Symmetry: C3
Amino acid sequence: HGPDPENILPIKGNRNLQFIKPTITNENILVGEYSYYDSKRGESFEDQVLYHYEVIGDKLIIGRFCSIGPGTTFIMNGANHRMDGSTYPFHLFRMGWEKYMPSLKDLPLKGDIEIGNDVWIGRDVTIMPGVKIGDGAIIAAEAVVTKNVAPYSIVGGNPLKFIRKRFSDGVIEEWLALQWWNLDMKIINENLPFIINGDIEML
Amino acid sequence: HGPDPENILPIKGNRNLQFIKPTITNENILVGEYSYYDSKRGESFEDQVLYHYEVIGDKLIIGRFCSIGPGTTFIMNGANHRMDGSTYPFHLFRMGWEKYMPSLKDLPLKGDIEIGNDVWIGRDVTIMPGVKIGDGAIIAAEAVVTKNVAPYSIVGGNPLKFIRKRFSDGVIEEWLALQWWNLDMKIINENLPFIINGDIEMLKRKR
Amino acid sequence: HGPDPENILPIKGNRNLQFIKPTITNENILVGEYSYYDSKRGESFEDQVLYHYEVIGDKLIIGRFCSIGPGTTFIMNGANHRMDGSTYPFHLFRMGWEKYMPSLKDLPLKGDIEIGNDVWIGRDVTIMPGVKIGDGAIIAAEAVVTKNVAPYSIVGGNPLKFIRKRFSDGVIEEWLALQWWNLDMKIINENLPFIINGDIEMLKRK
Ligand SMILES: C=CC[C@@H]1/C=C/C(=O)NC/C=C/C(C)=C/[C@@H](O)C[C@@H](F)Cc2nc(co2)C(=O)N2CCC[C@@H]2C(=O)O[C@@H]1C(C)C
Ligand SMILES: C=CC[C@@H]1/C=C/C(=O)NC/C=C/C(C)=C/[C@@H](O)C[C@@H](F)Cc2nc(co2)C(=O)N2CCC[C@@H]2C(=O)O[C@@H]1C(C)C
Ligand SMILES: C=CC[C@@H]1/C=C/C(=O)NC/C=C/C(C)=C/[C@@H](O)C[C@@H](F)Cc2nc(co2)C(=O)N2CCC[C@@H]2C(=O)O[C@@H]1C(C)C
Ligand SMILES: [Cl-]
Ligand SMILES: [Cl-]
Ligand SMILES: [Cl-]
Ligand SMILES: [Cl-]
Ligand SMILES: [Mg+2]
């Protein structure tokens, strides 16, 4: 009962909104069930993952029941130039320069992009490398995620600046202990009214 | 005398700059005459009004003699998820979930977008829901209008941050008292030199 | 030895990255050699220079060995309305309104855009009119360059906000004194290892 997490186009007539997990073809992208991307021009979610080279080996991770707004892009670590001296990538143009190859140790690598569950990412959000976003958080439109985002907090702007927390410090502990996105689907369905309207305490 | 406010493409040869009023087909959009949109790629002004659902009933109201720059978008209220608990729009995917439908009282609805007259909205500006922007203001390119914008003030950034007021308080009080955009068109042409070169005192003398 | 600065597509198979200098067909668009533009869908670098009217005469000047990222745009001075009174460009619509034409002394003109050498401009950067950006600087992706950028400083945001200086003051003084981008090309290849890894003690020595 509920849509098929493995069905790419779960909304009839709607060719723009896609469940991400079934469309992932490149490795190192790990997107949980039911998370979706609402595309501007109907293009694939993978087209929004930028500068993702297999040699650098970083991953992009997203949990379940995330909504990702149209135009959101993910700047993977391969985008960063070397910074010890000249940023110019001489080795790319070869003809004698190909022998000046940086290695992983020579680059400002920053780790994985880790986004939790039930995250609402707005429209045209740009996500910088190595960033961690917590569960239940809300990124505003046009945001540029430049620091980590705490669970169940609202953020937005460029550079990212904190706005507020969604619930009292105690109530957030409740959602994080609940972890409904992991509960058995037969159980999630029995409780969706409360997951949706926020009355968590009824469980 | 002057161009036709009702002519979609008022510049010869130009196919991107459009007078908005005559193009409006969909409801809950009220743009005043002579306001125009400079398109990036020929896209219509309405193409730039996003998440506008007739079921939510919010409106986009723009005044007269406004210049809305290429790529500007208007995030209407339908864009906001419910925020009591999970922000995930379960009901959209149906298959039993379609009964978990929110009501208007359940959503974070913030009211209309109200834009004044003689407003210069820059290129690639995102306007958030429920925002008011006063007469004669100037929105910098690439801005994200997140709070109200006072009349005859320059603003820009993401989030929106205040830069400066265009004229002194006493001078802004006069332009708003004047309201040159509402005068009969026979009178706007008679004073167009002074409307253009900022001479509120000369207009005062002729009023 | 090294690629041809005059070859439009210097990377085999790649059809998006282009050396800018050989792809300029208009005057007052001075980009130094080896500077390149990595395009989103194959658009040219000039396509990204907006509101550039020859009647206004401002120029866009970019140095050498610069990396201008996909989607960057350069707002030239023609973009600014007149701000004495109504910002509405009546004259454009003609039919009696063309007689109300502004002059150059009537517009908020701010001068050329001057970008230095070895500058890393990130992806989707907007550059406002009249701005200067110093040598070796790094502009973060999605930035809106609204004020000048000092040499060898990292900046980003909207509006632009200062992050940090790449090296100590004494070290930046040296790179600017050095000016490795202006040296003869026979010498740049001889020191490329140290230009790349910033062995300034070795560079001064040589
Ligand atoms: C272990 C370190 C990987 C190492 C290169 C590192 C390096 O120089 N990284 C700095 C990044 C520079 C960027 C993103 C520059 C943009 O301004 C233009 C490019 F986007 C154009 C373009 N990139 C590619 C092809 O075309 C391209 O293939 N790459 C870009 C970085 C990763 C990859 C590459 O050359 O990896 C090498 C592999 C093969 C040993
Ligand atoms: C009285 C409240 C109206 C109520 C539901 C409102 C509601 O759930 N609003 C939250 C907004 C969610 C958004 C913007 C989610 C994006 O991540 C993806 C969507 F954009 C994709 C998409 N939207 C639609 C079709 O496809 C779509 O039809 N709608 C989106 C909001 C309005 C409308 C809708 O479901 O209205 C209902 C009517 C019909 C009973
Ligand atoms: C010595 C001063 C030059 C003078 C007028 C300058 C002037 O009024 N500048 C203010 C800028 C207004 C802008 C950028 C308005 C946007 O909202 C829509 C336009 F982009 C649409 C559009 N522009 C054009 C054609 O279509 C267009 O031809 N121009 C725009 C500014 C330069 C140029 C122009 O009118 O130059 C005149 C010459 C020819 C006598
Ligand atoms: Cl790329
Ligand atoms: Cl993009
Ligand atoms: Cl939409
Ligand atoms: Cl233009
Ligand atoms: Mg900011």
